[PDB]
RNA sequence: GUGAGAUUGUGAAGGGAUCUCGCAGGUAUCGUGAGGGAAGUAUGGGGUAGUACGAGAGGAACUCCCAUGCCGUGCCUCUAGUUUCUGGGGUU
């Protein structure tokens with residue numbers, strides 16, 4: 358983000374992202390039981406949400422459901438570079 | 451088989467055969483829902499916010515409330531309209 362801290366809540370499988378570009382809308386995703394949702398503390402990494410499971414295309418599916426809720430609408434996306442972006446794809450073991 | 455009719459072109463009482471269909475439904479209520487029809491559509495305000503963005507000039511948006519235009523289906527408590535209740539009165 359550029360100006361507004363994106364606040365991503367994680368309780369259970371549910372995930373709530375608020376304050377995306379200062380909007381008052383809350384965006385809601387119900388992650389399946391096959392994928393676990395974690396969150397790194399801001400001591401180590403600034404803001405990371407962790408999607409882990411066994412199916413590749415259920416972990417990759419949920420990380421792009423999350424990417425596409427937070428899309429900039431009716432402004433220039435070259436200037437408004439805000440969102441939730443996948444940077445790394447790893448294993449657990 | 452059993453009931454009911456008819457055989458009406460030349461008089462009458464008789465009674466033979468034959469043909470036609472009647473022989474099981476009527477009445478009353480609660481539902482099914484195929485198929486067909488098919489509808490709601492727009493707007494402004496509040497705050498978000500003078501914030502995002504921007505050198506400045508300027509200048510957004512969603513959740514969320516509050517109303518409104520056009521349309522639709524009704525309704526008659528109120529208000530308004532209508533009076534051959536010629537209702538009560540007035541007046542030529």
Ligand SMILES: [Mg+2]
Nearest residue numbers: 485486487488
């Ligand atoms: Mg239908």
